[PDB]
Design a protein around this motif. Structure first.
Motif, short mmCIF file in Angstrom:
data_model
loop_
_atom_site.label_atom_id
_atom_site.label_comp_id
_atom_site.label_asym_id
_atom_site.label_seq_id
_atom_site.Cartn_x
_atom_site.Cartn_y
_atom_site.Cartn_z
N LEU A 30 0.83 -1.20 0.00
CA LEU A 30 0.00 0.00 0.00
C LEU A 30 0.87 1.26 0.00
O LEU A 30 0.49 2.30 -0.55
CB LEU A 30 -0.94 0.02 1.22
N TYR A 31 2.04 1.15 0.62
CA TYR A 31 2.97 2.26 0.70
C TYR A 31 3.58 2.55 -0.67
O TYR A 31 3.61 3.69 -1.12
CB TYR A 31 4.08 1.96 1.72
N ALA A 32 4.04 1.50 -1.33
CA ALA A 32 4.65 1.62 -2.65
C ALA A 32 3.60 1.95 -3.70
O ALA A 32 3.91 2.42 -4.79
CB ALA A 32 5.39 0.35 -3.01
N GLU A 33 2.35 1.68 -3.37
CA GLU A 33 1.24 1.95 -4.26
C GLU A 33 0.90 3.44 -4.27
O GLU A 33 0.51 3.99 -5.30
CB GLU A 33 0.03 1.13 -3.81
N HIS A 34 1.05 4.09 -3.13
CA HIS A 34 0.62 5.48 -2.99
C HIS A 34 1.72 6.38 -2.45
O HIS A 34 2.13 7.34 -3.09
CB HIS A 34 -0.59 5.56 -2.04
N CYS A 35 2.21 6.03 -1.27
CA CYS A 35 2.99 6.94 -0.44
C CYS A 35 4.36 7.26 -1.04
O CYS A 35 4.87 8.37 -0.88
CB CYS A 35 3.18 6.34 0.95
N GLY A 45 11.12 11.32 1.77
CA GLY A 45 10.60 12.24 0.78
C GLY A 45 11.28 12.05 -0.56
O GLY A 45 11.58 13.01 -1.26
N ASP A 46 11.48 10.79 -0.93
CA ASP A 46 12.21 10.44 -2.14
C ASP A 46 11.26 10.42 -3.33
O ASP A 46 11.65 10.05 -4.44
CB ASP A 46 12.86 9.07 -2.00
N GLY A 47 10.03 10.81 -3.08
CA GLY A 47 9.01 10.77 -4.10
C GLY A 47 9.27 11.74 -5.23
O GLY A 47 9.62 12.90 -4.98
N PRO A 48 9.12 11.30 -6.48
CA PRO A 48 9.30 12.17 -7.65
C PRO A 48 8.23 13.26 -7.72
O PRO A 48 8.48 14.37 -8.19
CB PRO A 48 9.16 11.22 -8.84
N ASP A 49 7.04 12.94 -7.22
CA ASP A 49 5.92 13.88 -7.23
C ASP A 49 6.01 14.84 -6.06
O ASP A 49 5.25 15.80 -5.97
CB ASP A 49 4.58 13.12 -7.18
N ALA A 50 6.98 14.60 -5.18
CA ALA A 50 7.18 15.44 -4.00
C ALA A 50 7.85 16.75 -4.35
O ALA A 50 8.12 17.57 -3.48
CB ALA A 50 8.00 14.70 -2.96
N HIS A 51 8.13 16.96 -5.63
CA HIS A 51 8.79 18.17 -6.07
C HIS A 51 7.83 19.06 -6.84
O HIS A 51 8.21 20.11 -7.36
CB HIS A 51 10.01 17.85 -6.94
N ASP A 52 6.57 18.65 -6.92
CA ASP A 52 5.56 19.43 -7.61
C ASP A 52 4.41 19.76 -6.69
O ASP A 52 3.33 20.15 -7.14
CB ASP A 52 5.05 18.68 -8.85
N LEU A 53 4.64 19.62 -5.39
CA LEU A 53 3.62 19.94 -4.41
C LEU A 53 4.01 21.18 -3.62
O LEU A 53 5.05 21.79 -3.89
CB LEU A 53 3.35 18.74 -3.49
N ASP A 54 3.19 21.56 -2.66
CA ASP A 54 3.43 22.78 -1.91
C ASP A 54 3.98 22.49 -0.51
O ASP A 54 5.11 22.88 -0.21
CB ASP A 54 2.17 23.64 -1.85
N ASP A 91 -9.38 0.40 3.43
CA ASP A 91 -10.06 0.07 4.67
C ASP A 91 -9.14 0.28 5.85
O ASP A 91 -7.99 0.69 5.67
CB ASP A 91 -10.56 -1.37 4.64
N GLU A 92 -9.62 0.00 7.05
CA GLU A 92 -8.81 0.16 8.25
C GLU A 92 -7.54 -0.66 8.14
O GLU A 92 -6.45 -0.16 8.40
CB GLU A 92 -9.57 -0.24 9.51
N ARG A 93 -7.67 -1.91 7.72
CA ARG A 93 -6.53 -2.80 7.59
C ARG A 93 -5.44 -2.19 6.72
O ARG A 93 -4.26 -2.29 7.04
CB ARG A 93 -6.95 -4.15 7.01
N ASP A 94 -5.84 -1.54 5.64
CA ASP A 94 -4.88 -0.97 4.70
C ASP A 94 -4.10 0.15 5.36
O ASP A 94 -2.87 0.18 5.32
CB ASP A 94 -5.59 -0.43 3.46
N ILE A 95 -4.83 1.06 5.99
CA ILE A 95 -4.23 2.24 6.59
C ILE A 95 -3.50 1.90 7.89
O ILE A 95 -2.44 2.46 8.18
CB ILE A 95 -5.30 3.31 6.86
#
Ligand code: HEC
Length: 116
Positions: A30-35, A45-54, A91-95
């Motif tokens: 779930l982490y590699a899917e989203h986070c 904060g190694d996310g590529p999309d982390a450089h186009d946010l505020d 669901d709860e399990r995922d989070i």
């Protein structure tokens, strides 16, 4: 709002999922899917999309041990800045497993390996 909107009551709501195989294995999925797109694979904060946010994606490695299970869970559930609330899709399990994965890795990287 003007920052983190999370009720203190739910902050003390420790996710009723034992941090272990399911939490860490499935949580990683779930982490590699989203986070990872913002928080990265190493929770730094190694996310590529982390450089186009505020707002800052924060160093989860350091942040997670200082935060509570419910606090982190609620933020994944309802959202936290540029990240949408996954409480309607997941669901709860995922989070809950997500938080356990985050907590475990963060504390592991904070404690283990550090002599000081
Ligand atoms: C970029 C669009 C993000 C994605 C994808 C995910 N998160 Fe995120 N997260 C992001 C930001 C910019 C912030 C900080 C904003 C703020 O209001 O402070 C966060 C914060 C969190 C936190 C709280 C950490 C803290 O504030 O100390 C948690 C627990 C968190 N994010 C979890 C999380 C998970 C599990 C994700 C994948 C499902 C995820 N985030 C994706 C930006 C982004």
């Amino acid at each position: 709002g003007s920052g983190w909107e999370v009720p203190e009551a739910e902050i003390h709501r420790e996710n009723p999922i034992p941090p272990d195989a399911r939490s860490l294995d499935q949580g990683g999925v779930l982490y590699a899917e989203h986070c990872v797109r913002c928080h990265g694979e190493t929770l730094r904060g190694d996310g590529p999309d982390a450089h186009d946010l505020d707002p800052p994606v924060a160093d989860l490695v350091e942040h997670a041990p200082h935060h509570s299970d419910g606090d982190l869970a609620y933020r994944v559930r309802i959202g936290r800045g540029p990240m949408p609330g996954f409480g309607d899709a997941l669901d709860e399990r995922d989070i809950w497993d997500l938080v356990n994965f985050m907590r475990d890795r963060a504390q592991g990287a904070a404690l283990a390996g550090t002599n000081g």
